[PDB]
């Protein structure tokens, strides 16, 4: 009788059961062991290398594993592959579509990912023998704006498009090996775990669903946020991850806890977050807010360790090097401030 | 090495800088345009009436040596709270609204809330909107046929009359111009409600005449960069 309402109430009681199971293992929080370790203080990082080569607003960026070559996306149709050590542009990829929203550096440095409102993930070859940069694979199977994507290897990547579905692509042939379905809202950002076996993607439903690359199914669902999760980054330990949504709060979820542990909230900041990254140790949560300033949130002390000056427009892209050497912050002013 | 790969990387950076300076000329020369509507609001006719131009994703037209980048969004999803933020450096937001769709659904109020969200946005607040009241050829007979009235989905029509500063079309019922301009002022009521001075609505009655609609975009985009530069020098 009333299979629609029956399944709705079954989902409701399952949600209550999951919430009760979360609260059962939530006898304490991350803010209750704050009297056991020393704080970090207000450390103000400075712009070490300034990257001014973009024409339109910089919407996406990604660091390389060498922590030297960083790529960045902008609405001008250019994918500038910077060199953070010498402040040089290694490549300027002419993009097919002007508006692009995603950027992903290959773990080997040979490939790069792009895409946006075109619903097409344009993979470009970096170390190719053809001289300039050309397209390597045209991953066109999404029906929404490709918000963010990450590079597992030079063979398969995962993209979070605006069609409420993520998908593990394949650079070899160009088809979705497995589609990550389950997001009720358009997915805005995904993050790869250091183990690269599973990933979590933050969508516009305040639910950063944890997926598994191997089985292609949704592992967990983290419904602790309140607005569109535009940023996400997996804790360097691999069992946790932070999220940046439009509700002006960041939350550090844990895969082994299936709930939020830390709430990076501050009444002085009311703008949303679209840039989240962790340091080498995960203590500093680089969170790029929409007030033109990035707050270096302490993942264990519930406070920012000093906001980031410089950028005068919304920072929609931010990443920390694989060794935590520096963090390149790119905002909507066509600039990339690399902090250290 | 010391100056083998360092100087070579610097030369590559210089070549990339030259290419980027060459592309910045055309980037600032062309004006990106956001073409969107409330769903089957006649935007297909605007894509047709724009340089007669990978389907409906982006069209480029050039008038008086001024190229434009009219980006259509007829292939995205319904939720438009994130991809519309990518149009923050866009020059104009051409809102193609079916002016005769106030009942068929109440697409005007759907477009009003779309216009109000575009107008009062956090990123689209510094960008004007070229209001294209499309489907006007159907509005020329929609109010007289009785199949679609204004009062059933807009009670402010009884308290509204044709403005004195209006330019009615020769050969139209004053009830049509009263209804056509009510839709214009309905979008303008929420447009001028911002009061920021950084962006102003450009209401045009589209699909009524088959003239060059990009010429209307050209004259609007000309005043867009005018008032943007006027606001830059505190002259407006």
């Amino acid at each position, epitope marked *: 009788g009333s299979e629609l309402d029956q399944l709705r109430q079954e989902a409701e009681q399952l949600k209550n059961q999951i919430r009760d199971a979360r609260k059962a293992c939530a006898d304490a929080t991350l803010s209750q062991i704050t009297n056991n370790i020393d704080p970090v203080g207000r450390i103000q990082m400075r712009t070490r290398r300034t990257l001014r080569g973009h024409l339109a607003k910089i919407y996406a960026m990604h660091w390389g594993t060498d922590s030297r070559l960083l790529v960045s996306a902008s609405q001008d149709g250019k994918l500038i592959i910077w060199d953070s050590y010498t402040t040089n542009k290694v490549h300027a990829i002419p993009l097919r579509s002007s508006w692009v929203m995603t950027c992903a550096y290959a773990p080997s440095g040979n490939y790069v990912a792009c895409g946006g409102l075109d619903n097409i993930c344009s993979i470009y070859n970096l170390k190719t023998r053809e001289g300039n940069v050309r397209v390597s694979r045209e991953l066109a199977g999404h029906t929404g704006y490709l918000s963010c994507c990450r590079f597992l290897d030079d063979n398969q990547i995962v993209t979070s498009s605006g069609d409420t579905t993520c998908a593990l692509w394949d650079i070899e042939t160009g088809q979705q090996t497995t589609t990550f379905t389950g997001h009720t809202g358009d997915v805005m950002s995904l993050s790869l775990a250091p183990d690269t076996r599973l990933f979590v993607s933050g969508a*516009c439903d305040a639910s950063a669903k944890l997926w598994d690359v191997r089985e292609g199914m949704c592992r967990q669902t983290f419904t602790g946020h309140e*607005s569109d999760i535009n940023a996400i980054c997996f804790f360097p330990n691999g069992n946790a991850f932070a999220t940046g949504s439009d509700d*002006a709060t960041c939350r550090l979820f844990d895969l082994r806890a299936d709930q939020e542990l830390m709430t990076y909230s501050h009444d002085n900041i009311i703008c949303g977050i679209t840039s989240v990254s962790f340091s080498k140790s995960g203590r500093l949560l680089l969170a790029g807010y929409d007030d033109f300033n990035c707050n270096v949130w302490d993942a264990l002390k519930a406070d920012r360790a000093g906001v980031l000056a410089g950028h005068d427009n919304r920072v929609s892209c931010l990443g920390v090097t694989d060794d935590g050497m520096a963090v390149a912050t790119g905002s909507w002013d066509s600039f990339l401030k690399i902090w250290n | 090495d010391q100056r083998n790969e360092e100087k070579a990387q610097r030369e590559a950076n210089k070549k990339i800088e030259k290419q980027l300076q060459k592309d910045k000329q055309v980037y600032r020369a062309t004006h990106r345009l956001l073409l969107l509507g409330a769903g089957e609001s006649g935007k297909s006719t605007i894509v047709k009436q724009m340089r007669i131009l990978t389907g409906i994703f982006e069209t480029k037209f050039q008038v008086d040596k001024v190229n434009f980048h009219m980006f259509d969004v007829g292939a995205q999803r319904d939720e438009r709270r994130k991809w519309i933020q990518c149009f923050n450096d866009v020059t104009a937001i051409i809102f193609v609204v079916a002016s005769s769709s106030y009942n068929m659904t109440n697409r005007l109020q759907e477009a009003l809330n779309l216009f109000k969200s575009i107008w009062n946005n956090r990123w689209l607040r510094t960008i004007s909107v070229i209001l294209f009241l499309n489907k006007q050829d159907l509005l020329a007979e929609k109010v007289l046929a009785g199949k679609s009235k204004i009062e059933d989905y807009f009670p402010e029509f009884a308290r509204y009359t044709t403005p004195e500063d209006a330019t009615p079309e020769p050969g139209e019922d004053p009830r049509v111009t009263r209804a056509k301009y009510f839709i214009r002022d309905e979008f303008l009521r929420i447009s001028t409600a911002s009061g920021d001075g950084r962006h102003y609505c450009y209401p045009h009655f589209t699909c009524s005449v088959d003239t060059e609609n990009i010429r209307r975009v050209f004259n609007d985009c000309r005043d867009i960069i005018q008032r943007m530069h006027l606001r830059q020098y505190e002259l407006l």
Partner: nanobody
Amino acid sequence: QVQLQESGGGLVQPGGSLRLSCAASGFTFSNYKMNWVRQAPGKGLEWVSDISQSGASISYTGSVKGRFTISRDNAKNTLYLQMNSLKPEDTAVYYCARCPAPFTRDCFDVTSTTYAYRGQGTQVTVSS
């Protein structure tokens, strides 16, 4: 978690009164521009009313302008839509769609189905 349950509704006579109680839990209800949308059988999701974060910017659609009445309760975290002088065309499942970005006067919750911060939907229908 964002979750919106609207109590009330049902089958009433055209021209009477009706009031929906939208339970807004899981977010700062006093910081989001909460609004009301409906979806008539055979029609898409149409915006009905809207109210600011504190209760100043109150707006309604033309079909309900003067008839309905929205009122937010920031103390109880509840959004109300006092429906008065009902019409035969008010037969729709009213949703409690919420604006996603807080502290903003803009949002796109009038879009099609599968909206995140939207109520579950109460079938508010009338006779004739």
